[PDB]
Design a protein around this ligand. Sequence first.
Ligand SMILES: COc1ccc2nc(C)c(O[C@@H]3C[C@H]4C(=O)N[C@]5(C(=O)NS(=O)(=O)C6(C)CC6)C[C@H]5/C=C\CCCCC[C@H](NC(=O)OCC5(C)CC5)C(=O)N4C3)nc2c1
Ligand SMILES: [Zn+2]
Length: 197
Amino acid sequence: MASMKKKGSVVIVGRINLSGDTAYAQQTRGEEGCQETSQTGRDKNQVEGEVQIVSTATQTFLATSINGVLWTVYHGAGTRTIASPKGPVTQMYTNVDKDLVGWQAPQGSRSLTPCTCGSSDLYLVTRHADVIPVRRRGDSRGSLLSPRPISYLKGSSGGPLLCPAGHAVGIFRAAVSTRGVAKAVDFIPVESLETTM
Ligand SMILES: COc1ccc2nc(C)c(O[C@@H]3C[C@H]4C(=O)N[C@]5(C(=O)NS(=O)(=O)C6(C)CC6)C[C@H]5/C=C\CCCCC[C@H](NC(=O)OCC5(C)CC5)C(=O)N4C3)nc2c1
Ligand SMILES: [Zn+2]
């Protein structure tokens, strides 16, 4: 069929700045430039940092570099390429059973180190640069110390859960809610990433 369309690439549209004493979101590309970059797959913007804000034509979420792989959720990215300076980059990891995908980390990004602390005092980083204390409750669950409406977590899948030392403990996947209040989060453990690799 000569009519059949191709889905666009995932596009980096900003980042969560964790460099200093204050966490804050930065936008690096507007909606229109995102639209064109998604269709061409050609993204000339400089990439920095560990947590990227990413978008498709219809969804926005996060992606996190750990050990030289930019990781995110399958329910956001599907099987899509990511835009890069030389054109679309095909996924190097895809696992729908884990809700997980990964591409080679962009040039200029910084990678988080996988946590080996065994600590259960975690920190979730959201797309609004909120740093949310989370107590680990199992291999893939943690409770929010201060619950809040799921609205505040929407769009943060693909972001990191970090240990007190700033290592990557997991990738935020799903919210566990009661009457619209997020009491707990479900995440992909970093060990599951390390095994996928
Ligand atoms: C298609 O192929 C696949 C393969 C595997 C897969 N595996 C999943 C677990 C999954 O789940 C769905 C997406 C996910 C998010 O919503 N993810 C974010 C998020 O932010 N997404 S997002 O906005 O960035 C978006 C949509 C990308 C743009 C983090 C939340 C934030 C708010 C959630 C509010 C309402 C939703 C509450 C819900 N809860 C829950 O399902 O609990 C289950 C469990 C743990 C047993 C009890 C929930 O979280 N999700 C539902 N889809 C798939 C799909
Ligand atoms: Zn650690």
